[PDB]
């Protein structure tokens, strides 16, 4: 549907299958947020129907053991001072240590300001112990969320049930003919578009030699020349349009890793799934009663929300026990008025 | 001949032909392949689903002319109207904060430091003390803009072409009524919000049928929208008919609209000729059930008021 859904599909942890569970046998205790999910699974992004809790998403900083156990990083603290040495811990090793909280006041030298801090003890127990006995600390406040949940501004002000829908509905957006980036963002939108892979990046450094609507030619410093082609109006798995456009000039200098061409839901390298509109919060004559919405006509006369959908049809010509089917313009059953748009 | 299905249209943008004689891989038994691509451009309309990043979700009820829309003091119409009754009871107040910050980012601001940095802006960086119109900002997921900062920025925004500030320190503005002309009596919240278009469009969900293809074993209408099928009248929908007392509607819905093969044609002829609708016959699924029961070595028969089993096969 769009790059975000493709990236999210490849990061899914599924509890069903030949060797796991069943949608009918699974009860209510395998669909709960265990205290050991902190940093390994996202507690918010999950389906809304009969598969609630049976499908989840990996967190941003998580990684897998050579055995199959998910790890997560921490910062080691000694003598009340936070160091900068990162150690990856599995859920079976972090229950013997006191782990602090990401939102903790830290001075210039690295000592806690508050006398007592909120920690996590052995059995996922929350306590208020003082800043002299902790042994580890979190790496960032977004350690426990996935790639689509980390794209909601002001998430800490929203309930879990509504944030669940907000994360689920970002994967159902359609590409529009023109894209524009949010006025208010989060900063995850730049590396969520490069890693998805629907843009074109440069594999070496050089200057741009020729630019057209379907190819870019880059001359490297050593002498080699590389050309990149574009997919113009390609059909995706869901009938949407996947179009790539160049965003460079004819004399620019390009560094390795720079974004060279845009994509379906991209605006200058960052993901853009919607548009910025001027809002009013008020009832109006009952036309927005019970979750309805009133729009303006400037959004139809100016192509603000317009999308292109492509379809595909096939047919086959084969042999028969009575002969062989043939594709031809000559049909002795129908008139000549409906055979005017056919070629030779 | 390959024809366009029901309710489709659009230009033709590509043809890919595969042949056997020109050394192309093909399934055995076929001689030529061809694919046709058809594209269309879809605008926004009633029934289409919109959404935000916080859980807001609804379909479009009306589209209004730009002269029928509430407008600001300089004549700027608004683009979308959302209701206020759904916010407090669902505990998603991030959307209002987003609209406030979006207005501040769109208009641009500047913090005065003639007598030193104000007390509320002590922890702000030095590059966030001034911004240009149509600026882009970033508020991380669990460490972002506080409420003292938003409240202080809402009173620093720049004016427009004429030296006017339309939105006051609370984020509220006075709007005019585009149908009657009088101002609205109380200030209203205004701002900018990020709206996405969801892939649930009304053009792919409308369907209707009078008659069409039928099944083979049980001669009921086919199912689905691609095959021009009918709508199921399930078990729970029969209980409502039986609780209303409607004995004729249910009988017509169950015999001459689903299974009565001989009554289906006569009903159509009666409707076309303008006469009275005939009397229902007997459904085919009952006969299929009886022939199913007889194959398990069960001697099931339909008797009359004095024995003498009825044939139940027509044919005469």
């Amino acid at each position: 549907n769009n790059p975000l859904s493709g990236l999210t599909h490849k990061r899914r942890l599924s509890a069903l299958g030949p060797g796991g569970l069943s949608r009918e046998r699974a009860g209510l205790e395998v669909r709960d947020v265990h205290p050991s999910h902190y940093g390994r699974m996202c507690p918010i992004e999950t389906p809304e129907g009969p598969n609630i809790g049976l499908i989840g998403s990996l967190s941003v900083y998580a990684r897998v053991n050579p055995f199959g156990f998910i790890e997560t990083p921490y910062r080691k603290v000694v003598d009340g001072v936070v160091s900068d040495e990162i150690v990856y811990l599995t859920a079976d090793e972090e229950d013997r240590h006191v782990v602090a909280q990401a939102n903790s006041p830290i001075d210039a030298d690295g000592r806690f300001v508050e006398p007592r801090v909120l920690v996590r003890r052995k059995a996922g127990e929350v306590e208020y112990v003082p800043s002299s006995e902790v042994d580890y600390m979190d790496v960032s406040p977004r350690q426990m969320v996935s790639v689509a949940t980390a794209m909601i501004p002001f998430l800490e002000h929203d309930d879990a049930n509504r944030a669940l829908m907000g994360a689920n509905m970002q994967r159902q957006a359609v590409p529009l003919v023109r894209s524009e980036a949010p006025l208010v963002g989060t900063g995850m939108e730049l590396r969520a578009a490069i890693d998805a892979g629907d843009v074109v990046v440069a594999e070496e450094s050089g200057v741009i030699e020729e630019v057209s609507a379907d190819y870019i030619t880059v001359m490297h410093d050593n002498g080699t020349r590389r050309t990149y082609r574009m997919r113009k109006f390609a059909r995706s798995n869901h009938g949407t349009c996947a179009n790539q456009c160049p965003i460079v000039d004819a004399g620019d200098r390009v560094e390795a890793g720079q974004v060279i061409a845009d994509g379906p839901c991209t605006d200058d390298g960052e993901m853009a799934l919607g548009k910025n509109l001027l809002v009013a919060i008020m009832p109006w004559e009952g036309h927005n009663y019970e979750d309805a919405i009133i729009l303006s006509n400037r959004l139809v006369e100016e192509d603000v929300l317009t999308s292109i959908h492509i379809e595909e049809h096939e047919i086959d010509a084969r042999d028969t026990k009575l002969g062989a089917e043939e594709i031809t313009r000559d049909i002795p059953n129908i008139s000549d008025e409906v055979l005017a748009d056919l070629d030779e | 001949s390959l024809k366009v299905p029901h309710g489709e249209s659009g230009k033709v943008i590509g043809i890919r032909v595969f042949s056997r004689e020109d050394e192309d891989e093909l399934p055995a038994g076929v001689n030529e392949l061809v694919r046709v691509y058809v594209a269309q451009k879809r605008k926004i309309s009633d029934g289409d689903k919109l959404a935000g990043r916080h859980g807001n979700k609804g379909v479009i009820g009306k589209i209004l002319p730009v002269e029928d829309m509430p407008f600001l003091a300089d004549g700027t119409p608004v683009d979308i109207i959302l209701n206020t009754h759904g916010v407090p009871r669902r505990m998603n107040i991030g959307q209002i904060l987003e609209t406030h910050l979006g207005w501040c980012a769109h208009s641009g601001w500047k913090v005065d430091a003639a007598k030193g940095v104000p007390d509320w802006a002590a922890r702000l960086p030095d590059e966030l003390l001034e911004a240009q119109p149509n600026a882009i900002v970033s508020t991380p997921v669990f460490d972002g803009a506080q409420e003292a900062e938003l409240q202080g920025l809402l009173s620093c925004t720049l004016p427009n072409r004429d030296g006017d500030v339309l939105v006051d320190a609370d984020g509220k503005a006075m709007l005019f009524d585009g149908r009657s002309g009088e101002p609205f009596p109380y200030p209203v919240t205004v701002g900018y919000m990020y709206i996405m278009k969801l892939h649930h469009l009304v053009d792919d969900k409308i369907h209707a049928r009078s008659t069409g293809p039928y099944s083979m074993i049980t001669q009921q209408p086919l199912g689905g929208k691609a095959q021009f099928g009918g709508q199921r009248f399930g078990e729970m929908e029969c209980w409502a008919m039986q609780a209303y007392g409607a004995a004729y509607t249910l009988q017509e819905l169950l015999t001459i609209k689903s299974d009565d093969t001989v009554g289906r044609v006569k009903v159509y002829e009666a409707i076309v000729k303008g006469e009275n609708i005939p009397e229902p016959g007997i459904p085919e699924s009952f006969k299929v059930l009886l022939k199913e029961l007889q194959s398990l070595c069960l001697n099931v028969e339909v008797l009359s008021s004095d024995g003498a089993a009825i044939e139940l096969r027509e044919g005469e």
């Binding site: 990162i86 790496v139 960032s140 730049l190 390298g269 | 911004a131 970033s138």
Partner: peptide, 21 residues
């Protein structure tokens, strides 16, 4: 940041990060 050519998006964050995703 950390990408050669990227739009300049100013941030409200008050914490620093010792690791990259």
């Amino acid at each position: 940041n950390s990408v050669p050519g990227a739009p300049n998006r100013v941030s409200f964050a008050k914490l620093r990060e010792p690791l990259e995703v």
